[PDB]
Design a protein around this ligand. Structure first.
Ligand SMILES: Nc1ncnc2c1ncn2[C@@H]1O[C@H](COP(=O)(O)OP(=O)(O)OP(=O)(O)O)[C@@H](O)[C@H]1O
Ligand SMILES: [Mg+2]
Length: 500
């Protein structure tokens, strides 16, 4: 069955089941179908021949999902733009893409863009005006036609197709041990593809998306009360977000008695975090997945068990889905032998058809191999019997003491030290070269009476792992590590405040 049909199926079998919920606003599979049908019909009547991508502005309102499906039912790809995206980048996206329409949940603040803006009331009138109407079944985006276009920080628009999303979703449902009618957490803003990991697997299995917004996360007591009521079963988020929840004593099986599946992607998953989770949720399975946005969310996955925890101090990123394959490459097109590190490369139906209008950018990253699209991740790693390991981004490989060290690796051994609960390394550069490393750490419990004593203890244990030239010169301590709007470590913010 087509992707949409797998979804529309629940509108029929389970019409009154909650499809999406954000705070008090809820929508059933029936309304979702009904309203997205009406929106699609409208889009077609307004743009009979055009199929340009459509922007969908908002945060966590149910209209975001209604609008996405409406856009694709009419043959248009959608571009999720979260309220957190700076206005300048939003305008860029407006002209960058060929978008001629922007649908908005709430009020659209960003200074007028060069597109037609349908918002708030306008959108409501459409659902009302076109209620009952249905789109031409044959207008639904298909095959290699764009489904959604999510942008890179900057600003490149990765084009994900129907076939791409179908390949990811089919895999996700299969190997993530998903069932039907489960409640899926949604922590990631829609302009971050990690959200796709829960949105579609949930919709095709008739689950319930339980959204957590930005303000709620800023007010911990609300977040946790919300989690206590969610009855979430499938947790999809970045490692950093789980860890912050973990900093909360009551966050365990007690708060989420039905938790059964954790899905992590986007950054390094600390062995300890997975450890605490396995402990706090003995009934749950932990999955670590890896992948860039250019390859449709994630391509590798592995069940992180105590066993894996016991034999892998540094957790692996998983096995590649069978319809794709991985390649590790060194200096030249030299395909490194299993065990050796090189840049990770992905090939298969998951790979993006390339950046939106920029054969210049699509040039270096994307290529063809035996007829299949391929993408260079910019990530360093290696394979061992089909199991992929992540070392770090090629860019976070710095040059100090005429020695080459990797940010991610140092952070790992640092995290391993006593008294260190959270840690990030900020490479400080004097002039145009890297002068020294600054360690920002969230201290665990301790009895030191003076800061210098704590820093000496950590540096001493750290020197038991890493060479002396890898040990950061300066340490700084704070109550928490900042997360960007996507839930990832805010390295930019950190470097900004080390400078200041
Ligand atoms: N399981 C994982 N373990 C470690 N790192 C991961 C994992 N999954 C993803 N990553 C990292 O996250 C990156 C993918 O993130 P994303 O697609 O959001 O773009 P980004 O690199 O974070 O930001 P940008 O917009 O600049 O590209 C990968 O290239 C990889 O370095
Ligand atoms: Mg990238």
């Amino acid at each position: 069955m087509k992707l949409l049909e797998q979804i529309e199926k629940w509108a029929a079998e389970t019409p009154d089941q909650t499809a999406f919920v954000w705070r008090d606003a809820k929508i059933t599979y029936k309304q979702l179908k009904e309203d997205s049908d009406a929106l699609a019909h409208w889009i077609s009547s307004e743009y009979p021949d055009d199929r340009s991508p459509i922007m969908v502005y908002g945060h966590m309102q149910p209209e975001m999902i209604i609008n996405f499906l409406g856009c694709v039912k009419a043959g248009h790809a959608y571009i999720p733009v979260d309220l957190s995206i700076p206005a300048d980048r939003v305008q860029r996206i407006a002209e960058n893409s060929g978008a001629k329409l922007l649908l908005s949940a709430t009020a659209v603040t960003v200074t007028d863009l060069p597109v037609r803006i349908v918002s708030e009331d306008n959108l409501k009138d459409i659902f009302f005006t076109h209620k009952g109407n249905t789109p031409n079944p044959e207008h639904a985006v298909k095959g290699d036609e764009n489904f959604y276009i999510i942008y890179t920080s900057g600003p490149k628009g990765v084009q994900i197709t129907y076939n791409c999303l179908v390949s990811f979703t089919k895999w996700a449902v299969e190997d993530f041990n998903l069932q039907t009618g489960q409640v899926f957490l949604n922590q990631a803003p829609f302009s971050f593809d990690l959200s796709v990991m829960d949105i579609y697997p949930s919709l095709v299995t008739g689950g319930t998306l339980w959204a957590i917004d930005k303000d709620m996360i800023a007010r911990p007591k609300d977040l946790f009360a919300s989690l206590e009521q969610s009855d979430i079963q499938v947790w999809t988020s970045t490692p950093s977000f789980a860890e912050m929840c973990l900093m909360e004593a009551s966050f365990s099986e007690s708060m989420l008695p039905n938790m059964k599946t954790f899905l992590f992607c986007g950054e390094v998953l600390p062995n300890e975090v997975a450890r605490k989770l396995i402990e706090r949720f003995p009934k749950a399975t932990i999955m670590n997945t890896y992948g860039p946005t250019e390859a449709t969310v994630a391509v590798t996955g592995i069940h992180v068990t105590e066993e894996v925890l016991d034999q892998y101090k540094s957790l692996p990123v998983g096995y590649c889905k069978s319809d794709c394959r991985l390649l590790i490459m060194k200096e030249d097109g030299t395909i490194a032998p299993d065990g050796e590190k090189g840049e990770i490369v992905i090939v298969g139906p998951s790979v993006s058809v390339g950046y939106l209008g920029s054969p210049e950018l699509t040039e270096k990253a994307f290529t063809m191999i035996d007829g299949e699209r391929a993408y260079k991740t910019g990530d360093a790693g290696y394979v061992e019997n089909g199991l992929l390991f992540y070392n770090g981004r090629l860019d976070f490989q710095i040059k100090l003491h005429g020695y080459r060290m990797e940010l991610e690796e140092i952070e790992h051994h640092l995290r391993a030290c006593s008294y260190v609960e959270g840690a990030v390394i900020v490479p400080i550069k004097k002039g145009e070269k890297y002068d020294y490393l600054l360690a920002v750490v969230v201290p665990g419990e301790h009895s030191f009476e003076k800061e210098f004593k704590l820093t000496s203890a950590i540096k001493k244990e750290l020197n038991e792992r890493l060479p002396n030239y890898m040990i950061p010169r300066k340490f700084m301590y704070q109550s928490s590590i900042p997360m960007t709007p996507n839930g990832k470590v805010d390295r930019k913010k950190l470097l900004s405040e080390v400078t200041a």
